[PDB]
Amino acid sequence: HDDQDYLHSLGKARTAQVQKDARIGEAEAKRDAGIREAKAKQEKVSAQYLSE
Amino acid sequence: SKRAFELQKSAFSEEVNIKTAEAQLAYELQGAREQQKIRQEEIEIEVVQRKKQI
After folding, report:
1. Where would I find the H helices in chain A?
2. Subunit comment for this entry (chain A)?
3. Chain A: residue nearest B3 by CA?
4. 10 Å Cβ neighbour count for B27?
5. Nearest chain A residue to B1, by CA
6. Is A46 in contact with B5 (Cβ distance < 8 A)?
7. Who contacts A52 (Cβ-Cβ below 8 Å, separation ≥6)?
8. Is A49 exposed, middle or buried (0-12, 13-18, 19+ CB in 10 A)?
9. Is the dihedral of CA B6, B8, B14, B19 positive or negative?
10. Which candidate, A46, A48, A30, A49, places its Cα nearest to that of B8?
11. Contact check, Cβ <8 Å, B2/A50
């Protein structure tokens, strides 16, 4: 046990190093979802106006 | 796409409004054309009257 917080920072380093991966995965997923969601939105609006 | 749709819709609205604007006032045009003869006879009334006032 350490009451001086000596080892807590050493532990927290790796937690940050894994949280960066946790965020990179979310960024990948969000960009990949948004790109094709916006594209499909575009096609449906274009077809709706073509019908109009 | 929105620009193309708006342009086509406004273009169509142009001639539809033109045809309507003709449609309301055709009534007044024919009404005046008929009022010509209506008043012609309404005034021939007293022409005939004054002809035999002689």
Report:
1. 6-51
2. Heterooligomeric complex of flotillin-1 and flotillin-2 and caveolin-1 and caveolin-2. Interacts with ECPAS.
3. A49
4. 9
5. A46
6. no
7. B5, B9
8. middle
9. negative
10. A49
11. no
